Amino acid sequence: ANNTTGFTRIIKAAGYSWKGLRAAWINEAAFRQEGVAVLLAVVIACWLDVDAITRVLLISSVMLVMIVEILNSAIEAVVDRIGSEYHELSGRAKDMGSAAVLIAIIVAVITWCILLWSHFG
Amino acid sequence: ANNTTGFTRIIKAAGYSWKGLRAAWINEAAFRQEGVAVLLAVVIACWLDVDAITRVLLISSVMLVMIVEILNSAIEAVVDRIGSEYHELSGRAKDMGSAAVLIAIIVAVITWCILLWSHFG
Amino acid sequence: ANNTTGFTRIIKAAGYSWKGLRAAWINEAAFRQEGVAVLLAVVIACWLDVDAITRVLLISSVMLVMIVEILNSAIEAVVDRIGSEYHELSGRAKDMGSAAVLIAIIVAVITWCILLWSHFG
């Protein structure tokens, strides 16, 4: 029996399968990406986040295009393979609150905080 | 005939119906909420609003999740109970302009204002 | 044969067809507008863009209403005349990456740049 000392690495090395994972980003996880990040991007953001928010502009701008690309994806998605998440159950009504819950604690607070700065800054 | 001096308060008091309104927020108005606020949030904003916009970051970030929760709501909504607003009539084409109208006066202005600050700041 | 010295201008002048193009903005291109701009708005932005991003607030706020107007348009669009772009082909999965591609170079960079400023600013 091949104790497999490292012969697999040679075969896999010549297969450069790693490349498959690189393309998978936009050629598969392209959807899960926008989500997976929001997780990794939050871990650090929580630690500390106080930039000029400039990043948002770039997003806000390109985001305009997204509504034409992404929305053109969702709109067609339901018509395409339609495979929404399995979590679906708490009705569509709560779906909105489900998000407002996490931020409810944040917004209600930060919302009044920033709004207050409006008085002077 | 019971002149109802305050017996109703006792019955209603033991019913704590008020709680029903609290949950209704996310357990009913969860959708109308995102809208109702935009009204109350605008009344004050108009009075004065000049923060660091930091609030947006929190929104922009969580907003990424929304596209996964909300969009997963709308996409399924049309498939669920489908009950769009009754205002629907001015075609879907104008629907876009209908918004651009209110801001048309704002953007066309503020858009050139902020863009101008790009020259120096 | 009428060499047409300028008689057309007189006829067209009395037709004020120009007005038709003005209304077409929100009465036709209302959809293409949100896109056409993003092109003209980017040409200058590229040249230079470093405002307080305040513009976003106005957008972010009104954007809340859009999800009620625009989304109510797309949701109904698929049900209305359904006429998505012809570009549709690279599957809906890549549709997400298709955008992440352009910004992939930007975000991956600016994302780490602004996040870094979090350390001090």
Tab-separated table of C-alpha atoms in Angstrom:
chain	number	residue	atom	x	y	z
A	1	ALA	CA	0.000	0.000	0.000
A	2	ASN	CA	1.357	3.405	-1.000
A	3	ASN	CA	2.055	5.147	2.306
A	4	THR	CA	1.716	8.310	0.226
A	5	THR	CA	4.908	10.096	1.260
A	6	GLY	CA	4.239	13.014	-1.084
A	7	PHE	CA	3.338	11.508	-4.455
A	8	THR	CA	-0.061	13.184	-4.185
A	9	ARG	CA	1.545	16.625	-4.064
A	10	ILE	CA	3.304	15.867	-7.346
A	11	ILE	CA	0.058	14.873	-9.050
A	12	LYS	CA	-1.893	17.736	-7.498
A	13	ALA	CA	1.031	20.078	-8.142
A	14	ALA	CA	0.832	19.340	-11.868
A	15	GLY	CA	-2.937	19.834	-11.659
A	16	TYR	CA	-2.623	23.330	-10.188
A	17	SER	CA	-6.092	22.745	-8.744
A	18	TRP	CA	-5.421	25.840	-6.640
A	19	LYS	CA	-6.228	27.885	-9.743
A	20	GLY	CA	-9.704	26.346	-9.786
A	21	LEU	CA	-10.358	27.888	-6.374
A	22	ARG	CA	-9.142	31.283	-7.580
A	23	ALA	CA	-11.603	31.393	-10.476
A	24	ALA	CA	-14.337	29.871	-8.320
A	25	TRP	CA	-14.380	33.206	-6.500
A	26	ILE	CA	-16.154	34.939	-9.389
A	27	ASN	CA	-16.908	31.665	-11.202
A	28	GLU	CA	-19.037	30.115	-8.442
A	29	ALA	CA	-18.827	31.867	-5.066
A	30	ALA	CA	-19.392	35.168	-6.877
A	31	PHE	CA	-22.667	35.253	-4.919
A	32	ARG	CA	-21.503	33.779	-1.621
A	33	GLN	CA	-18.531	36.097	-1.849
A	34	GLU	CA	-20.542	39.259	-1.303
A	35	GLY	CA	-21.712	37.468	1.851
A	36	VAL	CA	-18.635	35.598	3.089
A	37	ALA	CA	-16.696	38.861	3.068
A	38	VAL	CA	-19.331	40.747	5.072
A	39	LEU	CA	-18.322	38.243	7.744
A	40	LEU	CA	-14.559	38.652	7.465
A	41	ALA	CA	-14.951	42.386	6.843
A	42	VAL	CA	-17.027	42.704	10.027
A	43	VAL	CA	-14.598	40.849	12.308
A	44	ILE	CA	-11.979	43.544	11.725
A	45	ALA	CA	-14.443	46.431	11.433
A	46	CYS	CA	-15.697	45.570	14.909
A	47	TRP	CA	-12.159	45.704	16.272
A	48	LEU	CA	-11.924	49.266	14.967
A	49	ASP	CA	-13.557	51.301	12.193
A	50	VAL	CA	-13.453	55.092	11.852
A	51	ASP	CA	-12.426	56.010	8.304
A	52	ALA	CA	-13.755	58.857	6.165
A	53	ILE	CA	-16.326	56.421	4.771
A	54	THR	CA	-14.885	57.379	1.376
A	55	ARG	CA	-14.998	53.675	0.560
A	56	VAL	CA	-18.765	54.023	0.406
A	57	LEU	CA	-18.612	56.513	-2.473
A	58	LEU	CA	-16.869	53.982	-4.702
A	59	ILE	CA	-19.475	51.444	-3.644
A	60	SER	CA	-22.422	53.830	-3.901
A	61	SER	CA	-21.314	54.781	-7.412
A	62	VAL	CA	-20.667	51.276	-8.722
A	63	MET	CA	-23.689	50.181	-6.699
A	64	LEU	CA	-25.756	52.073	-9.243
A	65	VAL	CA	-24.450	49.668	-11.878
A	66	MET	CA	-25.123	46.702	-9.597
A	67	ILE	CA	-28.840	47.453	-9.504
A	68	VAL	CA	-28.541	46.927	-13.269
A	69	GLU	CA	-26.386	43.785	-12.990
A	70	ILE	CA	-27.379	42.214	-9.676
A	71	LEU	CA	-31.054	43.148	-9.826
A	72	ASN	CA	-30.977	41.848	-13.411
A	73	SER	CA	-29.695	38.672	-11.770
A	74	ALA	CA	-32.270	38.311	-9.008
A	75	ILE	CA	-35.135	39.313	-11.268
A	76	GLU	CA	-33.999	36.617	-13.686
A	77	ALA	CA	-32.949	34.286	-10.858
A	78	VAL	CA	-36.518	33.570	-9.813
A	79	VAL	CA	-37.120	32.878	-13.502
A	80	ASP	CA	-33.827	31.000	-13.921
A	81	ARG	CA	-33.047	28.165	-11.473
A	82	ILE	CA	-34.866	29.740	-8.505
A	83	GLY	CA	-33.075	28.336	-5.436
A	84	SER	CA	-33.584	30.752	-2.548
A	85	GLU	CA	-32.184	29.939	0.891
A	86	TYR	CA	-33.763	27.198	3.005
A	87	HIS	CA	-34.073	29.555	5.973
A	88	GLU	CA	-37.243	30.859	4.319
A	89	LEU	CA	-40.057	30.216	6.804
A	90	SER	CA	-40.412	33.209	9.135
A	91	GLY	CA	-42.670	34.723	6.490
A	92	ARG	CA	-41.508	37.544	4.239
A	93	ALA	CA	-42.877	40.153	6.623
A	94	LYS	CA	-40.441	39.335	9.426
A	95	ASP	CA	-37.679	39.048	6.832
A	96	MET	CA	-37.399	42.832	7.046
A	97	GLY	CA	-37.411	42.881	10.848
A	98	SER	CA	-34.924	40.012	10.966
A	99	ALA	CA	-32.342	42.547	9.801
A	100	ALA	CA	-33.704	45.502	11.739
A	101	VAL	CA	-33.231	43.327	14.824
A	102	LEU	CA	-29.441	43.130	14.654
A	103	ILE	CA	-29.134	46.847	13.850
A	104	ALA	CA	-32.181	47.851	15.954
A	105	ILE	CA	-29.757	47.988	18.857
A	106	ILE	CA	-27.193	49.770	16.685
A	107	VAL	CA	-29.312	52.190	14.617
A	108	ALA	CA	-31.652	53.343	17.432
A	109	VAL	CA	-28.374	54.311	19.103
A	110	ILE	CA	-25.887	55.447	16.445
A	111	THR	CA	-28.825	56.965	14.558
A	112	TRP	CA	-29.489	59.374	17.418
A	113	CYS	CA	-25.761	59.823	18.005
A	114	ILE	CA	-24.846	60.995	14.501
A	115	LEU	CA	-28.106	62.916	14.141
A	116	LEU	CA	-27.160	64.752	17.329
A	117	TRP	CA	-23.766	65.743	15.895
A	118	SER	CA	-25.885	67.629	13.379
A	119	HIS	CA	-26.292	70.255	16.093
A	120	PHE	CA	-22.566	71.000	15.971
A	121	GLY	CA	-19.480	69.613	14.242
B	1	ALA	CA	-75.383	51.845	31.196
B	2	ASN	CA	-71.754	51.689	32.314
B	3	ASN	CA	-70.524	55.274	32.025
B	4	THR	CA	-67.105	53.635	31.777
B	5	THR	CA	-65.241	55.650	34.406
B	6	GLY	CA	-62.048	53.645	33.929
B	7	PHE	CA	-63.052	49.980	34.008
B	8	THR	CA	-61.746	49.646	30.455
B	9	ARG	CA	-58.244	50.631	31.555
B	10	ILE	CA	-58.298	47.802	34.090
B	11	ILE	CA	-59.275	45.240	31.465
B	12	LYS	CA	-56.888	46.655	28.873
B	13	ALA	CA	-54.226	47.071	31.555
B	14	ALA	CA	-54.356	43.345	32.298
B	15	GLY	CA	-54.233	42.698	28.547
B	16	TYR	CA	-51.014	44.675	28.086
B	17	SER	CA	-52.126	45.131	24.479
B	18	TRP	CA	-49.374	47.746	24.272
B	19	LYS	CA	-46.925	44.857	23.938
B	20	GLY	CA	-48.733	43.758	20.780
B	21	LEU	CA	-47.837	47.090	19.185
B	22	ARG	CA	-44.197	46.700	20.213
B	23	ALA	CA	-43.827	43.336	18.479
B	24	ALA	CA	-45.915	44.531	15.536
B	25	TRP	CA	-42.942	46.732	14.670
B	26	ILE	CA	-40.919	43.770	13.397
B	27	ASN	CA	-43.903	41.389	13.485
B	28	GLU	CA	-46.067	43.307	10.993
B	29	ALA	CA	-44.880	46.841	10.215
B	30	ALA	CA	-41.388	45.427	9.672
B	31	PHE	CA	-41.912	46.522	6.053
B	32	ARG	CA	-43.801	49.766	6.613
B	33	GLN	CA	-41.228	50.592	9.250
B	34	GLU	CA	-38.385	51.066	6.793
B	35	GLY	CA	-40.766	53.561	5.170
B	36	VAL	CA	-42.539	55.238	8.093
B	37	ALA	CA	-39.159	56.142	9.568
B	38	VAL	CA	-37.868	57.687	6.336
B	39	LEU	CA	-40.679	60.149	7.013
B	40	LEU	CA	-39.902	60.853	10.662
B	41	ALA	CA	-36.165	60.680	9.962
B	42	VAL	CA	-36.557	63.276	7.197
B	43	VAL	CA	-38.542	65.797	9.256
B	44	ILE	CA	-35.570	66.249	11.586
B	45	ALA	CA	-32.901	65.773	8.913
B	46	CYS	CA	-34.429	68.687	7.022
B	47	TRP	CA	-34.211	70.872	10.114
B	48	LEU	CA	-30.476	70.170	10.197
B	49	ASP	CA	-28.163	67.395	8.998
B	50	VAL	CA	-24.372	67.620	8.704
B	51	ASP	CA	-22.800	64.590	10.387
B	52	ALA	CA	-19.766	62.610	9.235
B	53	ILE	CA	-22.155	60.309	7.369
B	54	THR	CA	-20.530	57.532	9.412
B	55	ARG	CA	-24.044	56.205	9.942
B	56	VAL	CA	-24.005	55.191	6.295
B	57	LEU	CA	-21.073	52.811	6.788
B	58	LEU	CA	-23.041	50.743	9.290
B	59	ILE	CA	-25.935	50.772	6.847
B	60	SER	CA	-23.805	50.142	3.763
B	61	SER	CA	-22.198	47.172	5.510
B	62	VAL	CA	-25.370	45.585	6.868
B	63	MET	CA	-27.041	46.640	3.624
B	64	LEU	CA	-24.946	43.960	1.968
B	65	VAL	CA	-26.761	41.413	4.124
B	66	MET	CA	-30.109	43.025	3.324
B	67	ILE	CA	-29.711	42.318	-0.380
B	68	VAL	CA	-29.583	38.703	0.826
B	69	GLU	CA	-32.528	39.057	3.233
B	70	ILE	CA	-34.702	41.779	1.717
B	71	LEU	CA	-34.081	40.872	-1.916
B	72	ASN	CA	-34.762	37.269	-0.869
B	73	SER	CA	-38.040	38.715	0.392
B	74	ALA	CA	-39.073	40.690	-2.677
B	75	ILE	CA	-37.967	37.964	-5.057
B	76	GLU	CA	-40.120	35.543	-3.078
B	77	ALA	CA	-42.783	38.188	-2.416
B	78	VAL	CA	-43.970	38.227	-6.013
B	79	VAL	CA	-44.094	34.442	-5.674
B	80	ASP	CA	-45.584	34.579	-2.164
B	81	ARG	CA	-48.705	36.724	-1.615
B	82	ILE	CA	-47.804	39.350	-4.241
B	83	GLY	CA	-49.532	42.536	-3.029
B	84	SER	CA	-47.676	45.521	-4.475
B	85	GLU	CA	-48.917	49.050	-3.800
B	86	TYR	CA	-52.097	50.315	-5.465
B	87	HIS	CA	-50.296	53.417	-6.729
B	88	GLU	CA	-49.019	51.241	-9.579
B	89	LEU	CA	-50.304	52.853	-12.781
B	90	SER	CA	-47.778	55.422	-14.020
B	91	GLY	CA	-46.053	52.545	-15.790
B	92	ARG	CA	-42.810	51.057	-14.507
B	93	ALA	CA	-40.757	53.377	-16.691
B	94	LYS	CA	-41.810	56.546	-14.872
B	95	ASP	CA	-41.425	54.687	-11.581
B	96	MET	CA	-37.718	55.486	-11.826
B	97	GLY	CA	-38.294	59.140	-12.706
B	98	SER	CA	-40.916	59.458	-9.973
B	99	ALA	CA	-38.010	59.318	-7.529
B	100	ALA	CA	-35.542	61.260	-9.650
B	101	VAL	CA	-38.145	64.033	-9.624
B	102	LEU	CA	-37.984	64.766	-5.901
B	103	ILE	CA	-34.172	64.581	-5.878
B	104	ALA	CA	-33.795	66.002	-9.423
B	105	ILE	CA	-33.926	69.396	-7.753
B	106	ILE	CA	-31.595	68.182	-5.005
B	107	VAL	CA	-29.061	66.020	-6.884
B	108	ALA	CA	-28.596	68.313	-9.925
B	109	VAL	CA	-27.633	70.849	-7.257
B	110	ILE	CA	-25.864	69.059	-4.393
B	111	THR	CA	-24.320	66.745	-6.992
B	112	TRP	CA	-22.480	69.665	-8.579
B	113	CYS	CA	-21.810	71.197	-5.164
B	114	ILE	CA	-20.002	68.215	-3.632
B	115	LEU	CA	-18.340	67.348	-6.937
B	116	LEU	CA	-16.978	70.893	-6.973
B	117	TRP	CA	-15.473	70.479	-3.491
B	118	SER	CA	-13.392	67.811	-5.202
B	119	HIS	CA	-11.292	70.682	-6.533
B	120	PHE	CA	-10.214	71.573	-2.999
B	121	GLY	CA	-11.024	70.471	0.545
C	1	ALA	CA	-36.147	70.705	-55.105
C	2	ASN	CA	-36.167	72.637	-51.832
C	3	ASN	CA	-32.490	73.157	-51.024
C	4	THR	CA	-33.761	73.520	-47.460
C	5	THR	CA	-32.050	76.777	-46.504
C	6	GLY	CA	-33.666	76.816	-43.064
C	7	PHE	CA	-37.365	76.138	-43.598
C	8	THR	CA	-36.996	72.998	-41.489
C	9	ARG	CA	-35.904	75.042	-38.477
C	10	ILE	CA	-39.104	77.069	-38.753
C	11	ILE	CA	-41.275	73.954	-38.788
C	12	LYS	CA	-39.252	72.242	-36.068
C	13	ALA	CA	-39.050	75.521	-34.156
C	14	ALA	CA	-42.846	75.684	-33.989
C	15	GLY	CA	-42.853	72.023	-32.940
C	16	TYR	CA	-40.554	72.636	-29.971
C	17	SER	CA	-39.609	68.967	-30.285
C	18	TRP	CA	-36.767	69.800	-27.901
C	19	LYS	CA	-39.336	69.673	-25.103
C	20	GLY	CA	-40.056	66.049	-26.000
C	21	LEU	CA	-36.442	65.199	-25.184
C	22	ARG	CA	-36.677	67.014	-21.851
C	23	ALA	CA	-39.663	64.971	-20.686
C	24	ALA	CA	-38.188	61.806	-22.185
C	25	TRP	CA	-35.625	62.003	-19.389
C	26	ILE	CA	-38.148	60.859	-16.779
C	27	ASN	CA	-40.761	59.888	-19.388
C	28	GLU	CA	-38.658	57.238	-21.152
C	29	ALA	CA	-34.952	57.271	-20.266
C	30	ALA	CA	-35.950	57.399	-16.595
C	31	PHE	CA	-34.324	53.951	-16.417
C	32	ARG	CA	-31.393	54.481	-18.769
C	33	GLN	CA	-30.791	57.751	-16.982
C	34	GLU	CA	-29.672	56.149	-13.740
C	35	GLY	CA	-27.162	54.359	-15.981
C	36	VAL	CA	-26.150	56.969	-18.562
C	37	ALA	CA	-25.209	59.331	-15.743
C	38	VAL	CA	-23.046	56.756	-13.954
C	39	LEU	CA	-20.986	57.067	-17.129
C	40	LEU	CA	-20.824	60.857	-17.290
C	41	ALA	CA	-20.554	61.068	-13.501
C	42	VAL	CA	-17.583	58.679	-13.575
C	43	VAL	CA	-15.618	60.524	-16.270
C	44	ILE	CA	-15.297	63.545	-13.982
C	45	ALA	CA	-15.094	61.563	-10.740
C	46	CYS	CA	-12.053	59.781	-12.149
C	47	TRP	CA	-10.395	63.106	-12.908
C	48	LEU	CA	-10.771	63.994	-9.230
C	49	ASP	CA	-13.101	63.019	-6.381
C	50	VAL	CA	-12.500	63.689	-2.681
C	51	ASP	CA	-15.617	65.264	-1.167
C	52	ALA	CA	-17.108	64.619	2.270
C	53	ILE	CA	-19.270	61.928	0.669
C	54	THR	CA	-22.192	63.897	2.120
C	55	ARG	CA	-23.891	63.369	-1.232
C	56	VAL	CA	-24.284	59.735	-0.243
C	57	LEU	CA	-26.448	60.590	2.773
C	58	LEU	CA	-29.063	62.226	0.560
C	59	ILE	CA	-28.884	59.182	-1.687
C	60	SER	CA	-28.810	56.650	1.148
C	61	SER	CA	-31.877	58.305	2.672
C	62	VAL	CA	-33.935	58.617	-0.503
C	63	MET	CA	-32.509	55.246	-1.516
C	64	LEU	CA	-34.689	53.792	1.217
C	65	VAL	CA	-37.704	55.066	-0.709
C	66	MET	CA	-36.280	53.709	-3.964
C	67	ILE	CA	-36.332	50.151	-2.652
C	68	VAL	CA	-40.071	50.838	-2.355
C	69	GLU	CA	-40.376	52.482	-5.789
C	70	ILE	CA	-37.642	50.878	-7.883
C	71	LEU	CA	-37.881	47.416	-6.349
C	72	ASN	CA	-41.653	47.754	-6.797
C	73	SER	CA	-40.727	48.371	-10.428
C	74	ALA	CA	-38.371	45.448	-10.977
C	75	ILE	CA	-40.561	43.053	-9.033
C	76	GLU	CA	-43.453	44.091	-11.261
C	77	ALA	CA	-41.196	44.449	-14.311
C	78	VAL	CA	-40.670	40.713	-14.648
C	79	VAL	CA	-44.456	40.482	-14.377
C	80	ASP	CA	-45.028	43.508	-16.627
C	81	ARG	CA	-43.283	43.576	-20.032
C	82	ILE	CA	-40.191	41.641	-18.893
C	83	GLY	CA	-37.412	42.827	-21.230
C	84	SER	CA	-34.079	42.305	-19.479
C	85	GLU	CA	-30.832	43.141	-21.268
C	86	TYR	CA	-29.592	40.948	-24.119
C	87	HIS	CA	-26.180	40.603	-22.477
C	88	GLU	CA	-27.737	37.874	-20.329
C	89	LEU	CA	-25.738	34.712	-21.045
C	90	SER	CA	-22.791	34.493	-18.641
C	91	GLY	CA	-25.175	32.812	-16.218
C	92	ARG	CA	-26.565	34.624	-13.191
C	93	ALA	CA	-23.749	33.348	-11.000
C	94	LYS	CA	-21.026	35.280	-12.820
C	95	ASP	CA	-23.360	38.275	-12.964
C	96	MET	CA	-22.211	39.050	-9.425
C	97	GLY	CA	-18.527	38.574	-10.235
C	98	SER	CA	-18.891	40.605	-13.427
C	99	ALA	CA	-19.177	43.638	-11.154
C	100	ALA	CA	-16.707	42.470	-8.531
C	101	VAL	CA	-14.213	42.251	-11.395
C	102	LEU	CA	-14.094	45.969	-12.169
C	103	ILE	CA	-13.941	46.886	-8.470
C	104	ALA	CA	-11.932	43.771	-7.482
C	105	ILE	CA	-8.882	45.814	-8.404
C	106	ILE	CA	-10.323	48.849	-6.624
C	107	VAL	CA	-11.917	47.359	-3.484
C	108	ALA	CA	-9.123	44.874	-2.629
C	109	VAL	CA	-6.988	48.023	-2.618
C	110	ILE	CA	-9.065	50.952	-1.334
C	111	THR	CA	-10.775	48.509	1.032
C	112	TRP	CA	-7.485	47.839	2.808
C	113	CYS	CA	-6.483	51.492	2.491
C	114	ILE	CA	-9.505	52.988	4.259
C	115	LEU	CA	-9.670	50.098	6.723
C	116	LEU	CA	-6.062	50.887	7.609
C	117	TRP	CA	-6.909	54.537	8.326
C	118	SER	CA	-9.066	53.026	11.053
C	119	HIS	CA	-5.844	52.660	13.029
C	120	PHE	CA	-5.456	56.439	13.159
C	121	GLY	CA	-7.192	59.492	11.711
